[model samples]
Target: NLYFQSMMSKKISGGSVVEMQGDEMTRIIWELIKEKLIFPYVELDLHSYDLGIENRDATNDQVTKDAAEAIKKHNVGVKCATITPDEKRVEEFKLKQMWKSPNGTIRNILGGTVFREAIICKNIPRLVSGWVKPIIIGRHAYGDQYRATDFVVPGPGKVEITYTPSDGTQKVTYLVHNFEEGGGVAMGMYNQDKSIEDFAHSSFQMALSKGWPLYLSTKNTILKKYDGRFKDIFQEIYDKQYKSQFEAQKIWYEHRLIDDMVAQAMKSEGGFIWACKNYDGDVQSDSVAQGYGSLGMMTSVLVCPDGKTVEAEAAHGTVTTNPIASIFAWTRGLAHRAKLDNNKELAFFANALEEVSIETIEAGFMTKDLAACIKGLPNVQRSDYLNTFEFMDKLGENLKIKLAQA
Candidate 1:
């Protein structure tokens, strides 16, 4: 009955997924995933949207807005990476106009902190090979520096910050600077209980989902109210709802100074979720990505909240023809599709298919990209990795073997 309804509707019936199409290698891989892995099992009501450049330009980027709205209503979207056109892309596509990054535009429309978490694979040698496990650095991407008021004070006077109640209750003034001797500048920014609560929720939820400790980085010792609110909110949420769950899992939530967290990150063998302020995570993400001698080998996954929504994008070439990141994009973002429909079988198969990819690399079969990490390109043999389609077919074969057992 469900499958019949799905076909009749021309979308998967039970599990509704807003499927986003993107450019280059990712679109091809996305289609392949639909053909080999997803369509075989999941009877989903897939609301497909092509976010390709041509479509976005043709629709005056209304496609992105419409796509984001669909995600808000249905609560799940699987996205492919899109091209944020530069002057080059503008010319290449002969676009209507340069469009802002669709992902950035969506985050604003969606109202959440989007974060990316990549799992550590053993066979995949990293820039920092010493760390034996995965690490997640999640940032509060909204508010703070992104929402600040600053001034380049030429000749400083007594500078003060004032807060007036919107309710017309009272007006209070706070002194920020008195440049007694020299000229300097001052800035003021504020965070909200609502935004912080969501921020804290995404952090805790992300950590809880991964079964890892959560550390929120802030300078609460200095900015007692501003940063302190972050520390206090995280503790309150953790104690109220998640404390027991965390304790059961033997993981905990703690706050760290940005300074303390960075030092700890460098010395430690990498296995914790460091919840950061916007400024800090932006810098730190680059640091970690750059650290691995095989930083080039790093695969990224970006989503604001773990369970809230899935980000989509498409790109190409790893073990020639295949890109694991593209494969990861579908499963990581769409795993919720199974949960949405209460379809354990579909979920298990999706989960199993991903494991086959990792297990394939772990158990000795690898792609040319994996081969690059082990040894330089000079020593890489043609047989070292599977071509793109062959790799997808290889994964499909392995998935079949695994699903048959189920």
Candidate 2:
């Protein structure tokens, strides 16, 4: 009776999931993953939002906002990669204006840190052979170069930074640059105390959750006031709130200069979290993703300061040759939902799918992109790798076998 009941019923009842669909190729893969790997195994309350390019343009970008609100309400969202339109995309889509990145808008509303970790398989050869594990990067995504105001000096001019107090305190001005000869460029950037504090908490939470050491990197040695604020905030929070917890776990938190930190990263075995300022995080995440093998294997999660709300997705773009990262996005989001709901069955299903995805690759059944990583692009035969649809089926078939075995 027990075996018959189990066989007849979908085992896990997953919690509410805000499903944000994307554009182009990833959108197709998204449906296939859900159809082949997800829907048959678990029952979930899925709130769907179309974040595709045309839909984004049609809705005036309100859909993205709505999706973010849903995630805030539910505390978990699994996203597909949507197009961030440029001038070229604007022409192609015939958009009203170049739409801002949905990811950026969602992150702005969510206000958290994004940590990207690579999925490692035994068969996928890594560029950095020394790195046996994944290097999780917590990127402080708010403000800095991405939001800075820059201008070209038509000729010689003086640039000054003025901070005006709202509470009737004296306004202060400092000369930023004095250009004496030809035209040059100047930029002004800023970071808020509140944003930096949240970034610190998210990074610490990630490290503690993983039971791994955390390192925050900054050019604080040079930027005594600006970068120093980041360093000080993280240290103060660590000492006041997290130090004891970290010690109990036998893990630590430390700060390093950005330059030296890169060197340390290259040399060290992985399994540590590196907290980075916005620009450095932007650069280093890509660098680390490339080093691991392929961006197709990188999984990204945006964790809020409370460590409750999260959004998961792949690190690569829509046109990626493989969908492992995207599939993991679903698994990671489902896993978080499972944890929040304390649904053990949901957790098991999520873990099983993830294991099967990796095992499928390990068993030499993978997308052409991963096979190319093993055998060179030219050397890869059709039989060496499954096509896109076939790969999804392979994972689906394996997942079915796994659940039946269980």
Taken over the whole model, the C-alpha lDDT of each candidate is 0.71, 0.89
The parts of candidate 2 lying over 4 Å away from their true place are 1-11, 151-159, 178-185, 318-320
Off by over 4 Å in 1: 1-14, 113-115, 141-191, 208-211, 219-229, 235-251, 278-322
**lDDT by residue (tens digit), candidate 2, 149-213:** 89988888899999999899998999988888777888899979999999999899889999999
lDDT computed for candidate 2: 0.89
lDDT accuracy of residue 248 in candidate 2: 100
* Per-model TM values vs. the true structure: 0.77, 0.92
Best by TM-score: 2
For candidate 2, report its TM-score: 0.92
Q: Model 1, 134-203: lDDT tens per residue? A: 6687766666766677888778488888889989788899888788687877788766787678878887
Winner by lDDT: 2
